[PDB]
Design an enzyme around this catalytic site. Sequence first.
Site, short mmCIF file in Angstrom:
data_model
loop_
_atom_site.label_atom_id
_atom_site.label_comp_id
_atom_site.label_asym_id
_atom_site.label_seq_id
_atom_site.Cartn_x
_atom_site.Cartn_y
_atom_site.Cartn_z
N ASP A 18 0.85 -1.10 0.10
CA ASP A 18 0.00 -0.06 -0.10
C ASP A 18 0.94 1.33 0.06
O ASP A 18 1.47 1.40 1.03
CB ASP A 18 -0.80 -0.13 1.27
CG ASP A 18 -1.81 1.18 1.41
OD1 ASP A 18 -1.98 2.14 0.36
OD2 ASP A 18 -2.57 1.61 2.36
N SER A 62 -0.92 15.31 -12.15
CA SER A 62 -1.00 15.36 -13.37
C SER A 62 -1.17 16.55 -14.22
O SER A 62 -1.84 17.35 -13.85
CB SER A 62 -2.02 14.09 -13.72
OG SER A 62 -2.64 13.85 -14.70
#
Length: 330
Positions: free
Chosen positions: A35, A199
Amino acid sequence: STGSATTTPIDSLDDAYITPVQIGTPAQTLNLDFDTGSSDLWVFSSETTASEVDGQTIYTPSKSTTAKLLSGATWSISYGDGSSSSGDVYTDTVSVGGLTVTGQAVESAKKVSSSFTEDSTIDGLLGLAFSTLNTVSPTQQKTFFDNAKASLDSPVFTADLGYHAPGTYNFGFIDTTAYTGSITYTAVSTKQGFWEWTSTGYAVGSGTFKSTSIDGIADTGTTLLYLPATVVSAYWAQVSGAKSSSSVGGYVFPCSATLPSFTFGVGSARIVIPGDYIDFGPISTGSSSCFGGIQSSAGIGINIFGDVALKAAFVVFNGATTPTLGFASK
């Protein structure tokens, strides 16, 4: 040194991925959920409340000759999906795919929430976010990667998650045969303890690319792709019959639909998530309403590039002095 381990979807939907981890001496192999959005290595154990164990493999520290109780240490964690766990702490030897850390904090669960109990395939979590998020008290502990880093050939790990197929976690090297083209690196902020990056935009299907900054985290422990409501609405608008359902808890779509791809930007590069990756199947057994793999982050407080996004790429988690993230197509 290096390590390399295969990671395997837990079910037919790729709801999560498990990777075998050797703990203790002799080794006790547990299948952990790696994770990159958390920083605790915790396991089901011989100390876990019996009624909360249902099919998991447990770590028994008393059977490990290298286990040592970390005196006075406890831990307690709550995850974004509402699940939680807590307990005490041992140090022990932990190996992943041939890479060994001695003295790793292994957090033994005394309690786990129902969603953990109900998932027999996950024996615990191995956190790969920054150690500043580790919950051990009163002395915070380091992640497996943080402990291994100085010994690694290069201070990196890579995630190569498969779509409906096994994939690979590598530590200490970049497998140049595992991706196509080049890896595009992008800046990371560690201020919230995550692999947080921005992004450069998105496209839906064959549509034009929208240049827009989307701050979010690369999170292998989250199944879906959570993005701003505007982006998500633009995606689902291209699927006839798709709608946001408050009762179900997100966007659903007719299972007869063909889903468009979703592209996200990494600098000037583009990662294309095929439409099929966005199908999470019937909302309930036998239903013709299917759950979407792209959902709104509104009210999460953060955008999350979870498995839906990451499995479309070869992803470098570069733990150099100034960390960065790399993405390649594959």
